[PDB]
Design a protein around this ligand. Structure first.
Ligand SMILES: [Mg+2]
Ligand SMILES: [Mg+2]
Ligand SMILES: [Mg+2]
Ligand SMILES: [Mg+2]
Ligand code: NA
Ligand code: NA
Ligand code: NA
Ligand code: NA
Lengths: 440, 440, 440, 440
């Protein structure tokens, strides 16, 4: 699926509806980013700029101006067309084509921004600006406001009020529209296909990075060129490191491998974690830990619905975890006391869920301890895990095991929809998939 | 192959040999780089820092101190070990293990650098520093020198001389050792295997990005996780854009596809360009242009040897090109006059060769117009191309054709060695490879 | 006179009354200012900080916090007491004595500001800050707001709205209270005594700087240690330069001398300009120009009252000037046409009046072309002048004459009060004063 | 006296003689300095810029270029002439008049510096620059060097070596020429006349600031418009504060007053301190302390000569002081032991002598503990003092006494010349001067 021209227009209007009359909002593009010397990384647009434009160039600024409650318009500053610069570095939109292509009322050259921006802000009461996001942007904005402040003999006046639009825009981004959900739904299918493929390709003697290669190839072939985050392939003890990205080790028969990977499809992030045996067959010790993480996931997927919270569901996961670990002799004592002492924290030291969207760790207010009441349109990860350190004082057979299982969901009117359920997570289904692949 | 501990030691000593007595050289690691919000790009070490250390962490500084012509030592500042930071973001070397692992005499915590660096620079005459490379580094160095300048009542004195070490270090990097050549030799084999695979997989109806996926998968499977630059797959008119990286178009029967891709293997860059027909069979018009570019490459490979220059060989390429284009009726006039008017420039607008090493566009002085005399150990690309614009005033059949063929070579005592010859470039060999693959 | 503790309290409350509930206002002290190497200029407090505190130290910040419409409090950050720093650089207020001495509720050490300010701003809706006034202040404020923005897991939130308090505070400063007027009244008496003394001391053969010395001595002896601006003593052609401060020339018999000087008394600026003959007797040519400037001043002093404007009175001055210059043959043509062509501008190129207070060119909105309606409590200068360049194409006898006469006034319920009338300006009174002095 | 055109030329040549061939030295003018809002302090040129030019404008840069051991030239960047800017803010030198007036070979507009400076530095080996002195200067220099570094395709190269010229220039400034000594000699006469006048004007009931006024008036009348530092008038307990500049107290019969003041004459600083009784008659307790400080001064003036050091003479002063304080019962114990314990430090906590020149605390290397061997042409202060705190545990009659007596001297071939001896310091001579004045 994709995001339509009309959707980008609706988003801008939704922002304008919330702005004060006599105001302007400034949204700046991301700068290009050096990898080494003269070579740059693949360009990644600022998520907020992208949200309002679907425009993937640097040196661009969107200005939305609200004159009053019925009148408003949009100006884009963007790179000029240039034959020499384009024969080298590829095509640019320019000013002539921008109004039509992007649905803005006016487009100006980014090279003229210091001569034009103060003219757009003159006499307004409020400017909405994300201060400290990018240094180049603060320079441009502070420079416009200084001209206006010092220009009273030329009948210029500066807006005295500056408001951060991020709280407002992040609240919009927190609730996904049907179009956004269709995109994320496809991101989830793509990400799942990559995880199925890694399970099917994994053999003892392959390196962790080989599975990374299979995953990226699968993303690419469905049109997701880049991952939404650095892929994690942690076999054995490397699975106890939460963001292990070295992916440098030989995968050994007897070990588990934890794969945490997600594609970026039309800007939107998938995020799946699967843990599975390198040799296609879980040991008893591995099943004992795996079943605790899986029950935590399956219970969470049953509970998440409008009217509950991440905090409330986390409480139920903690109970499942402490209960399971007491039965294995990994924790000792009374379950209720151990829960009150947060005795699970050495083994499960991260949150259960985070928002998901244009960023893998998405924007939006969580509330104290993630107590915010869930409502339809919210998209989140559910990612329980247990990590037993190599030197943990526990029975030998559980030391050095890291297991995480993560699904992505959207809250619906009556419950949730699982966007990532097309990759298996039940241990018998994992084993059948790997056996079937090893034949073929 | 790889670079040994002993090689990194030799490089540091070679730098120290050139330093003044009573001096210190400061080499700073690259900062981490944001992709979007809280997520970062895969870390890429500064090439000069990497050259002297093979150490792939941020927040690190190498200080080499020459007391006199027989005494010198090395201090490393680097991140401290930290259980919580490592359970999350993975393992760190720390101070205890650094002296041995990296062959430095002393290692200190990067968090103490502002309390320790001025003590290392006190009373020295010269400091070697790459000013303006990184802002965080200039802050650290200017801050140390200000303490010393203002500390005469505490018997501190600053070095009055600051020298840029980049000219010296870039002259070292320009001449590759046998170990470096073995690494680059393998980078070339890997890069060639990726290009062969793309030729074998290409079918009409695939998208440009699908070939990018095949290439990256092939890099990865030989241990080159990342490309050395953003892969270019330009089919049809997209081949006229020199650094086209959108790779967004459907590849059409009848078109050529230009693939410019290179792996990064142990820090070193491969760089190959191949142009070939999407449908596996060159048309007459396509052969006519291709043969000019190929003769330019083959002649260049014959000529490059110690004692000549990039400028001298470029002169011979220009002659081949203008001569070929006059025979096709793309240029009109006398060949010698057209050469004197630089009449090839609309069609061939970049250099023939650049240095190659830890950076794809490597460091090293070229001399005026690239007239520097070539010597053994220099590694370069040879990359002739012809690009006829869609709207060029030339016979219709040549409009919208972009063809580049690039090989990587090292200058040897008697000539050169071609590091990338294991991927085919003769048109009949390309066609046979694609036919063989289409059967299967 | 002086400004009472109670007055500073009323001003702070007047600011708080205008603030939104759930907000804080930050007012930063001026930094110390280098004259040369290690030596500094006499400290001059920021006018806005001074206005609210009467506290003459650097490294101080006033924070006014409005919790709601009935509750608010004040925190001062200021330098800690320190025996060694004080034996050297003199006494400091410290934290213990500040609440009582300055009438603030709490005082904290300036050295702890980065650890305490974000705690004061946490959870507020609005912060009032003069952005771009001082760089050290912006660093402190941006740093507090970044901690809050990134501290949601610690239950911190930043105020999303930032408002410039300068418009509000400058509107307060524009209207002087009775206490302020008593201070300015004394500043005017002191400044007048200095100008009388310069007229009485002036002899041919003295240097311009000698009169500067007499003026500064007179300021000092009444308790005004510093001038409010760099004293101007322009004799002859130097009087045509509006802010001549070289004061380097020998004063010649036959020349006029223009003295523009003003004391700073309790922070408040006097500003008087007088022009008079070096030899104590005006020539006919000098009287002809002087009488035009004097009529402009005397008429202005009659007209200024509530309900008129600087623009309206300037119109009447322009008429007097153009009329006078036509009678001398300095302008040729019809008076109404010459007025419409602004034909006075080569000879009178500055404004008639500016606001006066804690700054000589004081804060406050003038309106387009200085059209703002005057109201009681406004304090302004009235400073007509005529400057005929040495090379002006006018009758020889008027070339190189610069004449300015400036008085300071406060608008009252029925008219104005002249704060500077105790120094003579009528030519016969000037001459009598100088004759009497020469006997002384 | 004054400094000649020829002297400024000799200084520049002396710097050039020490520069490497193929180099340039950049000396930047001081920026203008805000006092309050739009008003600025009296301009004070950078001492090093002034030393080489005698040019008192901002926005100026001197570039001295040494091509080789016999060829060199000077370029000045300075403000362009501008009729409007000059009618307002006074006259400028401009480019046409600069070569002749200042003895430079070429003059360019400061507004073109970013377009011209890199052209002057292109292809040089060394640049001499005082890094971190002024931020605007570092911006200009870093910007020129970045253009050159990145301009190799345009055949530009940057100098790789940057050397701080301050050590060299400060060593030149440390040794005064005969012309400089004649200027300082007159600065000393002027400063002495001011101190004599303050002694003659002082009466009980005057404020400390009134004596400041008398002193500044006396400076001004001899052509020293500004003090070289903020005048100190500390009566009573205020004399125990080393840099007391509040000068706010009523001078009381029975108290001493310590006056520390110095004029700035042609850029050069006088610096005299005198202590004397407000009522013109020393008490016994006051004489007891005064005689110790005076013996310290008189002995120092006998000892200072080529071949000794500030450290060596300080040792003799410490002995005189500890010996005197033991006789008064202010210190108890054996003199040699008390000296070894540095028992004088509570009462005499600053150095005896500092260099004096264009800065009151002048440039030049002192050596460890000020052990540098004195040579002819060095100019220094000799300023012993004793400060007994109000709460010191000593006999009551000595509490709250601060006494400093300071003279300025130049080292000569056989001894020293006292530049400030024309103001009295013997107590009977002080008393006779004050009695004579009271009759006024
Ligand atoms: Mg195990
Ligand atoms: Mg065609
Ligand atoms: Mg005349
Ligand atoms: Mg006493
Ligand atoms: Na996640
Ligand atoms: Na290349
Ligand atoms: Na004025
Ligand atoms: Na002194």
């Amino acid at each position: 699926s994709e995001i339509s021209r009309q959707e980008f227009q609706r988003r801008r209007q939704a922002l304008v509806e919330q702005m004060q009359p006599g105001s302007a909002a400034l949204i700046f593009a991301a700068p290009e980013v050096t990898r080494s010397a003269d070579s740059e990384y693949p360009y990644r647009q600022n998520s907020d700029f992208w949200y309002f434009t679907g425009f993937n160039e640097p040196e661009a600024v969107l200005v939305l101006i609200k004159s009053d409650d019925t009148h408003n318009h949009s100006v884009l500053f963007n790179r000029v067309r240039d034959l020499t610069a384009e024969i080298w570095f590829g095509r640019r939109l320019g000013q002539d084509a921008a109004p039509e292509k992007l649905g803005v009322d006016r487009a100006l050259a980014f090279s003229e921004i210091n001569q034009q921006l103060y003219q757009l802000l003159n006499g307004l009461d409020v400017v909405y600006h994300a201060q400290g996001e990018y240094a180049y942007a603060d320079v441009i904005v502070n420079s416009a406001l200084e001209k206006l402040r010092k220009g009273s003999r030329q009948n210029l006046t500066a807006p005295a009020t500056m408001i951060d639009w991020r709280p407002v825009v992040h609240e919009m981004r927190l609730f996904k529209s049907p179009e956004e959900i269709a995109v994320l739904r496809r991101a989830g299918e793509i990400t799942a296909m990559a995880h199925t493929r890694a399970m099917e390709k994994c053999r003892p003697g392959m390196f962790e990075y080989h599975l990374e290669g299979e995953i990226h190839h699968e993303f690419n072939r469905h049109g997701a060129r880049y991952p939404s985050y650095n892929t994690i392939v942690g076999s054995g003890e490397n699975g106890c490191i939460l963001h292990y990205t070295e992916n440098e080790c030989e995968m050994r028969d007897g070990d588990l491998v934890l794969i945490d990977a997600g594609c970026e499809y039309k800007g939107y992030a998938g995020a799946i974690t699967r843990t599975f045996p390198v040799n296609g067959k879980f040991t008893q010790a591995q099943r004992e830990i795996y079943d605790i993480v899986l029950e935590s996931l399956e219970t969470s997927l049953r509970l998440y619905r409008p009217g509950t919270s991440i905090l409330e569901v986390t409480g139920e996961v903690v109970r499942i975890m402490v209960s399971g670990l007491v039965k294995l002799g990994i924790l000792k004592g009374d379950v209720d006391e151990l829960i009150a002492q947060n005795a699970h924290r050495p083994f499960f030291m991260h949150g259960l869920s985070h928002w998901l969207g244009l960023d893998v760790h998405d924007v939006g207010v969580y509330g104290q301890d993630r107590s915010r009441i869930l409502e339809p349109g919210m998209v989140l990860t559910v990612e329980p895990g247990l990590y037993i350190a190599p030197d943990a004082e526990v029975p030998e057979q559980y030391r050095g095991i890291g297991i995480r299982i993560e699904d992505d969901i959207v809250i619906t009117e009556t419950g949730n929809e699982n966007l990532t359920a097309s990759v298996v997570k039940k241990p018998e289904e994992i084993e059948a998939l790997m056996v079937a692949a090893r034949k073929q």
